Amino acid sequence: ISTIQPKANFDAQQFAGTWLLVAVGSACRFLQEQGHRAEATTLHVAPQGTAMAVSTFRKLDGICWQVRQLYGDTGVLGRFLLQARDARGAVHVVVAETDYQSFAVLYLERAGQLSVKLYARSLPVSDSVLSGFEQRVQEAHLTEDQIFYFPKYGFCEAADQFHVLDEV
Amino acid sequence: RLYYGDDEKYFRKPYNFLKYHFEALADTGISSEFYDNANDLLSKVKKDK
């Protein structure tokens, strides 16, 4: 395990805005166990100094939900920490790779438990990008059997006042 | 994963409680009433001689 290199000169202002989650690679059981109902997710992203706010949007049983989180910077460009809010333990984050207008591959890790997630500005992703993601997975020592996709449709926006987790 | 945590699932009951019993009920009652009356009389005579 190591902190891999981020996007060179990561521009939070360009990486800002709307991302759709496309696929996740992880050894996390709950993507393979109960891997059905991988409900679609999207981020709104804003810079907030060097930290970034993120609003994940999701459905849950058809109720649209918003989770707002601060990705605190590590003091290092493109490197962030999520807090141990519920004693979950802090999650290290690296913006490994992005075309700010097109695609991103984000590295996230806690307690050596590692995930990589591929987001896009777009419904399609270039198959070359997807292939890069596959090799990113292999380099992370994750199997193809630990890659999981998310549906093309049914993204949500603007969850209700009562359906915002607002963990911060 | 969005999931439910479980820390709050049980409480220890102090010895002095014979019963402690979680149970969700609501009731509401509303009553609303209006009464209005307007009563109006005019009366007039003109007598010319």
UniProtKB/Swiss-Prot annotation, chain A:
Q: Which UniProt keywords apply?
A: Complement alternate pathway, Complement pathway, Cytolysis, Disulfide bond, Immunity, Innate immunity, Membrane, Membrane attack complex, Pyrrolidone carboxylic acid, Retinol-binding, Secreted, Signal, Target cell membrane, Target membrane
List, in alphabetical order, the Gene Ontology terms for molecular function in this entry.
retinol binding
Its activity is regulated as follows: Membrane attack complex (MAC) assembly is inhibited by CD59, thereby protecting self-cells from damage during complement activation. MAC assembly is also inhibited by clusterin (CLU) chaperones that inhibit polymerization of C9.
Domain of life according to the entry: Eukaryota
- GO CC entries: blood microparticle; extracellular exosome; extracellular region; membrane attack complex; plasma membrane
> Which cysteines bridge via disulfide bonds?
C64-C156
Subcellular localization: Secreted; Target cell membrane
Q: Name one GO biological process term.
A: killing of cells of another organism
Where it mainly occurs, coarsely classed, is secreted
Assigned protein family: Belongs to the calycin superfamily. Lipocalin family.
What is this protein's function per UniProt? Component of the membrane attack complex (MAC), a multiprotein complex activated by the complement cascade, which inserts into a target cell membrane and forms a pore, leading to target cell membrane rupture and cell lysis. The MAC is initiated by proteolytic cleavage of C5 into complement C5b in response to the classical, alternative, lectin and GZMK complement pathways. The complement pathways consist in a cascade of proteins that leads to phagocytosis and breakdown of pathogens and signaling that strengthens the adaptive immune system.
Assembly and binders: Heterotrimer of 3 chains: alpha (C8A), beta (C8B) and gamma (C8G); the alpha and gamma chains are disulfide bonded. Component of the membrane attack complex (MAC), composed of complement C5b, C6, C7, C8A, C8B, C8G and multiple copies of the pore-forming subunit C9.
Q: What is this protein called?
A: Complement component C8 gamma chain
Q: Which organism is it from?
A: Homo sapiens
Q: Which residues of the full protein are shown?
A: 33 to 200 of 202
From Swiss-Prot, chain B:
Superkingdom in the source lineage = Eukaryota
- Cellular location of this protein? Secreted; Target cell membrane
Per the UniProt record, the associated disease is: Complement component 8 deficiency, 1: A rare defect of the complement classical pathway associated with susceptibility to severe recurrent infections, predominantly by Neisseria gonorrhoeae or Neisseria meningitidis.
Explain the purpose of this protein.
Component of the membrane attack complex (MAC), a multiprotein complex activated by the complement cascade, which inserts into a target cell membrane and forms a pore, leading to target cell membrane rupture and cell lysis. The MAC is initiated by proteolytic cleavage of C5 into complement C5b in response to the classical, alternative, lectin and GZMK complement pathways. The complement pathways consist in a cascade of proteins that leads to phagocytosis and breakdown of pathogens and signaling that strengthens the adaptive immune system.
Subunit (UniProt): Heterotrimer of 3 chains: alpha (C8A), beta (C8B) and gamma (C8G); the alpha and gamma chains are disulfide bonded. Component of the membrane attack complex (MAC), composed of complement C5b, C6, C7, C8A, C8B, C8G and multiple copies of the pore-forming subunit C9.
Record-stated family? Belongs to the complement C6/C7/C8/C9 family.
Query: What name appears for this protein in its UniProt entry?
Result: Complement component C8 alpha chain
Whichever gene encodes this chain, its name is C8A
Residue range from the parent sequence: 196 to 244 of 584
